[PDB]
């Protein structure tokens, strides 16, 4: 005698439900493309100091006299000769491969080498803030108006970032884009789960994952189609405009209406669902009286000792997983092969890794799967960072294996943290873990910023942190017995056993 009873009465596989899920999961390809866009919209082409116009190249016999060479047989990327001196007349970029990126229009090079990483860090700060505050805003307003606001904000911010007079405007609009995009990312699954019955909830989760993979495909497709960054960003952001346009056709989740103390809206929504589903005859029996008889915290997380330890461990796990995943995904320039091919192979490797990880976690365990994922990924990143730049195919195979390992790690940590926490604070634990993953994704570009000290130290850290987290995760209890802890006391009793 719960909400699921009425949900099954009205259907569960009906036309409205399938249409709504296949409609709401649709912008997740644009989610993936927007998250990974910095690879194609901020690629660094080879460049050198432009010789001053005072000297003539006709009498100089070439451009070698006005440009010092580096050890790799290329003109120096930050110096120019006096007859040395830093760039004073700008930079010269080629157009053989990348017609234009941000580092060629606003010359984010030399002294301003860290500005692209700072912009990505600001986008991740926007992601964190648009999760933190928009979760409360959605809980206080709803799950449809918030979604349409997310659509509008992400589309407007994408277009405005595409047409940016300078770099500060770009960073601010990336902040706003992260806000809206994180909010839609965390509200899509919530609304879809809250409308689906029990089994189609897991079906919807798998659908969301597969759509993410298809989006990783679509990013490479668009990048091959559109090379210009000012046009690539516009092409990625345009379908979000029609998304906001047609997002008014969604139906709000009835569970949120019930939780708000009102049931007439719930009855109206269910009757509308039956009308779309065609089961008006069965939905007519629904009424306020029937619904009335059928519809019947972070402080303590850091207060309780065992809860505090468990939160610390889960925080480290989420932090390292997001760290490694974003750091490895957002670097497809120094891997030899072209960006589009490596990106499409990255998208292809996602699904088999997820299938293998699901088989492993349902076969032998979850914590050993997290071991064989995180430690393997860390070792892969270390050996990638130590392998000389000359090797290309080995580096690319290592990178795709690492991306598959990170996807498997993400799935395993989600499915493990879902059944770890007691039911009292499980949702808050999931939210805290997601926040820790987002702050790890915040810090990862900041770590990559430190490539000035050493060209390979960002990869070294990106590998090392997962290794430490894998060592840390060995102290977590195994949850193959499916005890499903209820409260803190139940957690304590099963901990000893």
Ligand X SMILES: O=C(O)CCC(=O)C(=O)O
Number of residues in contact with ligand X under rule CB under 6 A: 9
**What is the enclosing helix (H) or strand (E) of 47?**
strand 47-49
Segment contacting ligand X by CB under 6 A, of 4-12, 47-55, 332-340, 406-414: 406-414
Joined tokens for residue 454: 């050493």
Which residues, 393 to 422, sit near Cl ion by CB under 5 A?
Answer: none
Pick between residue 136 and residue 453 the one whose CB is nearest to Cl ion: 136
Q: What would the x/- binding string for ligand X be over residues 341 to 360, using CB under 6 A?
A: ---------x---x------
In DSSP terms, 271 is beta-bridged to none
Q: What is the largest CA-CA distance in the chain?
A: 94
- Residue 292 makes CB contacts below 8 A (sequence gap 6+) with 263
Smallest separation (angstroms) from ligand X to the CB of 36? 9
Smallest separation (angstroms) from Cl ion to the CB of 441? 9
User: Closest Cα partner for 256 from 265, 268, 245, 247?
Assistant: 265
- Residue 300 makes CB contacts below 8 A (sequence gap 6+) with 307, 425
Segment contacting ligand X by CB under 6 A, of 14-22, 312-320, 404-412, 440-448: 404-412
Smallest separation (angstroms) from ligand X to the CB of 333? 20
By beta carbon distance, the residue nearest ligand X is 209
Is residue 212 involved in binding ligand X (CB under 6 A)? yes
Smallest separation (angstroms) from ligand X to the CB of 231? 25
Residues 413 and 370: beta-carbon distance below 8 Å: yes
Number of residues in contact with Cl ion under rule CB under 5 A: 3
Distance of CA 76 to the CA centre of its chain: 35
Q: What would the x/- binding string for ligand X be over residues 221 to 260, using CB under 6 A?
A: ----------------------------------------
User: Closest Cα partner for 200 from 443, 11, 434?
Assistant: 11
Segment contacting ligand X by CB under 6 A, of 155-163, 254-262, 405-413, 478-486: 405-413
Is residue 208 involved in binding ligand X (CB under 6 A)? yes
In DSSP terms, 93 is beta-bridged to 47
Residues 209 and 188: beta-carbon distance below 8 Å: no
E strands present in 145-239: none
Is residue 314 involved in binding ligand X (CB under 6 A)? no
Which of the listed partners (Cl ion, ligand X, none) does 185 bind, with a CB threshold of 5 to 8 Å by partner kind? Answer: Cl ion
Distance of CA 386 to the CA centre of its chain: 27
Which of the listed partners (ligand X, Cl ion, none) does 211 bind, with a CB threshold of 5 to 8 Å by partner kind? Answer: none
Smallest separation (angstroms) from Cl ion to the CB of 201? 18
Report the distance separating Cα 200 and Cα 25, nearest Å: 14
If one counts every other C-beta atom within 10 angstroms of the C-beta of residue 295, the result is 18
According to CB under 5 A, which one of 185, 236, 243, 412 is a site residue for Cl ion? Answer: 185
Report the distance separating Cα 61 and Cα 178, nearest Å: 50
H runs (alpha helix) in 260-330: 264-277, 280-283, 288-292, 298-303, 305-329
Which of the listed partners (Cl ion, ligand X, none) does 209 bind, with a CB threshold of 5 to 8 Å by partner kind? Answer: ligand X
Smallest separation (angstroms) from Cl ion to the CB of 127? 7
Report the distance separating Cα 433 and Cα 159, nearest Å: 31
Segment contacting ligand X by CB under 6 A, of 155-163, 204-212, 468-476, 486-494: 204-212
Which of the listed partners (ligand X, Cl ion, none) does 212 bind, with a CB threshold of 5 to 8 Å by partner kind? Answer: ligand X
Smallest separation (angstroms) from ligand X to the CB of 411? 6
Is residue 131 involved in binding ligand X (CB under 6 A)? no
Report the distance separating Cα 241 and Cα 117, nearest Å: 27
According to CB under 6 A, which one of 51, 75, 130, 209 is a site residue for ligand X? Answer: 209
The residue with tokens 């770890």 is 420
Smallest separation (angstroms) from Cl ion to the CB of 442? 12
Breaks (C-N over 2.5 A) in the chain follow: 83, 296
By beta carbon distance, the residue nearest Cl ion is 185
Joined tokens for residue 47: 């460049």
Residues 151 and 243: beta-carbon distance below 8 Å: yes
Smallest separation (angstroms) from ligand X to the CB of 122? 21
Which of the listed partners (Cl ion, ligand X, none) does 350 bind, with a CB threshold of 5 to 8 Å by partner kind? Answer: ligand X
Backbone angles phi, psi at 49, to 5 degrees: -60, 135
Backbone angles phi, psi at 186, to 5 degrees: -85, -10
The residue with tokens 């989600």 is 414
Is residue 407 involved in binding ligand X (CB under 6 A)? yes
Pick between residue 339 and residue 407 the one whose CB is nearest to ligand X: 407
According to CB under 6 A, which one of 311, 318, 410, 421 is a site residue for ligand X? Answer: 410
Which residues of this protein are in contact with ligand X, per CB under 6 A?
Answer: 208-209, 212-213, 350, 354, 407, 410-411
Q: Which residues bind Cl ion (CB under 5 A)?
A: 182, 185-186
């Amino acid at each position: 005698m719960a909400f699921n009873d009425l949900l099954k009465q009205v259907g569960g596989v009906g036309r409205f439900q399938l249409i709504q899920v296949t409609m709401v999961v649709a912008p997740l390809l644009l989610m993936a493309s927007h998250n990974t866009l910095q690879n194609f919209t901020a690629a660094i082409p080879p460049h050198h100091c432009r010789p001053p116009a005072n000297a003539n190249l006709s009498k100089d016999g070439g451009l070698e006299a006005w440009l010092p060479l580096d050890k790799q047989g290329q003109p120096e990327s930050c110096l120019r000769f006096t007859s040395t001196e830093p760039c004073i007349d700008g930079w010269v970029y080629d157009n053989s491969t990348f017609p234009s990126t941000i580092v060629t229009e606003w010359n984010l090079v030399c002294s301003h080498r860290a500005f692209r990483q700072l912009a990505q860090s600001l986008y991740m700060v926007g992601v964190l803030l648009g999760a933190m505050v928009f979760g409360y805003l959605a809980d206080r307003l709803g799950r449809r108006k918030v979604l349409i606001l997310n659509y509008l904000q992400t589309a407007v911010s994408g277009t405005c970032a595409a047409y940016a007079p300078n770099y500060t405007v770009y960073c601010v609009f990336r902040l706003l884009s992260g806000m809206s995009l994180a909010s839609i990312a965390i509200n899509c699954m919530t609304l879809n789960v809250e409308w689906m019955p029990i089994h189609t909830r897991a079906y919807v989760g798998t659908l969301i994952g597969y759509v993410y993979s298809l989006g990783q495909f679509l990013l490479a497709g668009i990048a091959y189609a559109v090379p210009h960054w000012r046009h690539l960003q516009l092409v990625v952001s345009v379908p979000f405009f029609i998304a906001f346009i047609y997002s008014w056709f969604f139906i709000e989740s009835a569970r949120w209406y019930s939780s708000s103390g009102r049931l007439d809206l719930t009855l109206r929504a269910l009757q509308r669902v039956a009308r779309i589903n065609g089961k008006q005859e069965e939905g007519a029996k629904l009424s306020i009286e029937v619904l009335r008889t059928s519809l019947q915290s972070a402080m303590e997380l850091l207060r309780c000792p065992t809860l505090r330890h468990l939160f610390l461990c889960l925080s480290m796990l989420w932090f390292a997983t997001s760290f490694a995943y974003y750091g490895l995904v957002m670097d497809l320039q120094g891997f030899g092969v072209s960006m589009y091919l490596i990106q499409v192979i990255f998208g292809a490797v996602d699904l088999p890794a997820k299938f293998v990880c699901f088989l492993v976690i349902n076969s032998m365990g979850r914590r050993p799967a997290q071991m064989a994922s995180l430690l393997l990924a860390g070792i892969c990143i270390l050996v990638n960072g130590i392998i000389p730049k000359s090797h290309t195919i080995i580096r690319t195979s290592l990178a795709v294996l690492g991306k598959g390992c990170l996807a498997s790690s993400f799935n395993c940590i989600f499915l493990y943290t879902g059944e770890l926490y007691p039911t009292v604070i499980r949702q808050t634990g999931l939210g805290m873990g997601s926040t820790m993953a987002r702050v790890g994704s915040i810090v990862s570009p900041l770590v990559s910023m430190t490539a000035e000290f050493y060209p390979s130290m960002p990869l070294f850290i990106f590998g090392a942190v997962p290794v430490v987290a894998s060592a840390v995760t060995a102290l977590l209890p195994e949850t193959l017995g499916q005890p499903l802890p209820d409260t803190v006391q139940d957690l304590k009793s099963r901990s000893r056993g």
